[PDB]
Every structure is written in structure tokens, then in C-alpha cells.
Amino acid sequence: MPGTKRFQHVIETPEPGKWELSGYEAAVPITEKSNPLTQDLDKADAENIVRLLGQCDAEIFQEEGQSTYQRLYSESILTTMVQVAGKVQEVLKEPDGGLVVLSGGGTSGRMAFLMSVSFNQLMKGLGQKPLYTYLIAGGDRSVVASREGTEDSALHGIEELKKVAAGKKRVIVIGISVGLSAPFVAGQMDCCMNNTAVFLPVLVGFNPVSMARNDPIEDWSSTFRQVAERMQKMQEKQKAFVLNPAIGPEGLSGSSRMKGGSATKILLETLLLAAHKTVDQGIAASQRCLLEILRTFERAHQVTYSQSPKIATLMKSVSTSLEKKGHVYLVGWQTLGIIAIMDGVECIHTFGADFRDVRGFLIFTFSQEDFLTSILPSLTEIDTVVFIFTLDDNLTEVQTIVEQVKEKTNHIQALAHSTVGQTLPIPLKKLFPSIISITWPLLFFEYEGNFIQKFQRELSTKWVLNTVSTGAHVLLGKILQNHMLDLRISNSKLFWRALAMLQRFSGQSKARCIESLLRAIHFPQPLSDDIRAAPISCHVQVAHEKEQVIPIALLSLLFRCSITEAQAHLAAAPSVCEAVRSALA
Ligand SMILES: C[C@](O)(c1cnc(-c2ccc(S(=O)(=O)c3ccc(N)nc3)s2)c(Cl)c1)C(F)(F)F
Ligand SMILES: O=P(O)(O)OC[C@@H](O)[C@@H](O)[C@H](O)[C@@H](O)CO
């Protein structure tokens, strides 16, 4: 019938009580699964939330059990890492016409960008000439914006890739998609396999290939699954690579910006650093070299979450300020500035949050006096301002700005990275009563800019920022069990996530859930055969512009009622959350 083929890959809702062993749940990709640790995240105080996410983050480093999925510390994965480091060496040896592209949509793209810069600096430091570049869905503007719709075109992907691979002669394309999902990457990987001479594809994500996305891409004939399967075949001949350890579901279901983003850094920084530091030593990269760095990244989680209690409190002061319709400012220097912006921008799509809700700032890019003149005026009793820096920063610039802000806020906290035995200038630097001091052992670096220290610090910040920003919103009651129900459908992935959530919460059939969703999306227009059969992009374009689409659809299902009737009920209730929560009972 009309719609059949578009919705073919979707599995029927299991019967009440038979979800567990169901065919359905066995095909939910790991990255979209509901994490058992956070079943009750929506009922947790600030300290539990920190504990729970610290724990979910910790799953990145958990080792493989004995009939089960490969993980970061499994020998197949490290062997692949070694192998790829090997292929990066080849390019470094011959840099003329050599290039290394890191590419991804959304947060995978944001992480691509950071890493491209770091390794460019590193070659700058050696006076070698940068070999890295990055690609993000929707162009460079996307690095610091909410642009979730840009990832759905394989041709776009390929076009960006063809622009940058100029007339290069050896190109490594590292396509990063946490879910093995994004059509942007899919096309790139497939294009690379059609020209093995020039290109070498390396696919990075966190699902097994048997769980790689398999629904049709609107502008492309093959699915991610197929592309990934074909890459894995080519890996036997060392002409493609798939790097895909499981790291367990996200604490907030499907919020791949979190564990997904971190594992991407951990994994790629490790590998590329090993490649660099081992070429100049005249020595192959080895499991043992990779391990040193993995274990360092693993210490960094421990180091970071030692500050849990303070972290729980910064959460409360962020949540509070937002509960009162305040704003929250994230002020950081160098790369940690960037990471702050990236965190705040992500709150827009992840939480329906306005750009002012949680905004990042780098000394978006406003200098000392510039920030003092324009932004300083707008602060208020109830706002929260967060400062983020190392002791190797310009701390005269830092202290200055804290000074002005203090008079206007009082809710100011900070996040300070130091090697042990650097001290906080002003013993009255107690403009921060009890800081989040993060103090790093001394490590035997040998490169100029101390790149392992950089990565530790970024990562630790990302965890803190992520845990804080996500935590604040959970406390505000905007999350359901461990799902963001009320999201904005702005790409096809998010459309599938919506549909899945309707099945899960209603317990009703595929067909009913599909019907309720499309009615919610296209109301006031009823379901035509055209509409039922439309490409998913057509539904996205309409949904992207509306509010409460998913809850309206869930209410229509639970009350077995019309869209007209469900909107009226929603408007009859004190809040979306309360309308839904009570409808679930
Ligand atoms: C966990 C849950 O069942 C669920 C959530 N999201 C989903 C999905 C979201 C998006 C998809 S998807 O875009 O088809 C996709 C995305 C990635 C991938 N590798 N394969 C499929 S499935 C599913 Cl299948 C289940 C629940 F409960 F959240 F609804
Ligand atoms: O890395 P993937 O699976 O291709 O996902 C790419 C993007 O959709 C994703 O990173 C999204 O922007 C984030 O808001 C998810 O938390």
C-alpha cells in the first residue's frame, strides 16, 4: 500500500511484556538503546545524575566480556588502530599531494574540526606543513551552529570531499558517524571505494556493522550498512578500515554528542598521536604505544569525575538559573573556549533550548574589551557564569573579567586545569570560594605544544560541560525516563527516533504510531496517499517548523483521539511534561 516501502525497515511494536527478548530490541542499534543505568534519570538529584553519567562515560573503557561485541580494548580494534596509524605514516613520509580528511555531521563534525587543528599545530611545531583538514555537514558555518538538517545528503558529502581533495594524490578519509548513520559520511566512504588508487576510507562509529543504518538515503542507492559491509570486506586487503568498538548506550538515549563525541576524540587522538610520535622515532606504531595513551585517557575520567560533588553543584546553579528564566554563560580560553560554544549550541537541538539559554564564549569569539562592553551589561542576579581555563592562560585577562562579572552575578564558578604545583594567583583568587581545580600529574611529553596535555584537558572539559548542560535540563523535568521525547524533527534519523519513541511509550502498533506521527506533522492537512508515500525528507521539512509534534502524536495515541482533540487537551494542561506524564497514567 502507500507508505509500505518507506517504512519497511521498521519493526512491529512488541506485545505488552514481550519487549525483552523481542526481535525488535535485538535490532535497536547500541547507539539508540536505552541505557539501563539511567532508567530513572528523570528522578535523580544533581549528585546521582553526575554519578550516573560518570558511570555511562566509564563504559567507553570497559573491556569485552566472554559471546559478545568488540570494544575499545579488544585486540581486533587495537590491531585496526595500529594498522591505520601505519597508513597515516605512509602519508606523512610523502606529504606532497598527501592529505588527511576528518569528516562528520554535527558533533562528529565538531570533533573533526578540533582534531584537524591540533594535528595541524603539531606539524606546524615541527615546521612540517599541515596535512589535515576537516569536513562538516553544511559547511564550516556548521562547526559552531545547530544545523541538524544538513547531514541527510550523500551528494553533499561527496561534493565537500571532492572540493578538498583538490588534485591530491594520496588521501585518507576518516568518516565519523557515531551511529554508522549519516548519509553525508556514507557517500564519502562509497566514493573513496570507487577510487582506491587515490583514496583510503576509514569509517569510525560505535555500532557493529550488522547494526549500521539500513533505510534508503534519498539521494543515494546504497545504504550505510552496505557501504560499511563492503568496507569491512576491503579491510582484509588493507584498502578500507572500519573502527567500531561498542561503548554502550548514551545516558540520554541517542544523544551521541556525549559518549559518542568523547570516544571519537579518545580513539582518534590516540591513534594519530601514536602515528606522529612513532614516525620521527623510525619505528612502527604498536599496541603498546596506543595503550599508554588510552590508559592516560582512562585516568583522565577518574581524574575528572573526582570532582563530582562540585560538578553536581554547578549543575544546580545552571539548572536554577534556567528554572528562573535566566541565562548561563560559558567563558573559556583557547580550545576550551571552543568546546564551551559547542556545548551550548548543542543544547538548542538536544533540548529545544534557545541560543541564549546556555551560550559559549571564547577570548561567539569576543576579545577582552569587546566582551566587557557588549555582553557584561546584560547580566543579572539569577544568571550563572562559568570560567574555563588553564594556569598557562593569560590570567591577568581572566581575573579582570571575573572582577566585573562578580558585582553583577555572584553565581560564578570555575574550571581550572593545572599541572600539580602551579598555584592560583591571588590567595584571594577566592573570587571562587570552592573551584573545580583539576590538577594533572606530570607526564613525559616530548612534542613542543604538549599535545597529550591538550587532549586530556579538552576531554575533561567536554565531560564536565556535557554532564552539566545535560544534567541541568533533566532536573528541569524536560526528559522522560531517559529519553528526550519532545524533540524537533530536523533530519531523518530524528524522525526514526520519534517513531520509535511513539511505539515504545504507547505500546501500540507500527501502523498506528506512523499514522499518528504523520497526522501530527501534517495537521491541518489529512493523510493523503501522496503524503503516506512521501520521502521522509518531506515530513522532516514540515515537522522542523512545528512545536510539540511528538507529544501531540503520543497524546492522540494514548487517548485514542484526533489531533484536534489532542492539541486541545495539551493546551488544557499546565505543561507539556505534565500533560504527557499524566497521560502515561
Ligand atoms: C530506545 C528506543 O526503543 C529507540 C530509540 N530510537 C530508535 C531509533 C532512532 C533512530 C533510528 S534510525 O535512524 O533508523 C537508525 C540510526 C542508526 C542506526 N545505526 N540504525 C538505525 S532507530 C530506536 Cl530503533 C529505538 C526508544 F525506546 F527510545 F524508543
Ligand atoms: O555521529 P552521527 O551518528 O553521524 O550523528 C551525527 C549528528 O546527528 C549528531 O552528532 C547530533 O548532532 C547530536 O546532536 C547527537 O547528540
Curated annotation (Swiss-Prot):
Statement: the UniProt record of this protein carries the keyword Repeat: yes
Database matches in SUPFAM superfamilies: SIS domain
Residues that, per the record, bind beta-D-fructose 6-phosphate: 107-108, 177-179, 493
GO molecular function terms listed in the Swiss-Prot or TrEMBL record: fructose-6-phosphate binding; glucose sensor activity; kinase inhibitor activity
Reported tissue expression: Found in liver and pancreas. Not detected in muscle, brain, heart, thymus, intestine, uterus, adipose tissue, kidney, adrenal, lung or spleen.
Keywords, in A-Z order: Carbohydrate metabolism, Cytoplasm, Mitochondrion, Nucleus, Repeat
Domain (SIS) ranges: 88-284, 318-478
Annotated Pfam families: GKRP-like_C, GKRP_SIS_2, GKRP_SIS_N
GO CC annotation: cytoplasm; cytosol; mitochondrion; nucleoplasm
Binding site for beta-D-fructose 1-phosphate: 107-108, 151, 177-179, 346, 493
Keyword Oxidoreductase part of the UniProt annotation: no
Cell location: Cytoplasm; Nucleus; Mitochondrion
Quaternary data: Interacts (fructose 6-phosphate bound form) with GCK.
Stated role: Regulates glucokinase (GCK) by forming an inactive complex with this enzyme. Acts by promoting GCK recruitment to the nucleus, possibly to provide a reserve of GCK that can be quickly released in the cytoplasm after a meal. The affinity of GCKR for GCK is modulated by fructose metabolites: GCKR with bound fructose 6-phosphate has increased affinity for GCK, while GCKR with bound fructose 1-phosphate has strongly decreased affinity for GCK and does not inhibit GCK activity.
Domain remark text: Fructose 1-phosphate and fructose 6-phosphate compete for the same binding site.
Family affiliation: Belongs to the GCKR family.
Name the record gives this protein: Glucokinase regulatory protein
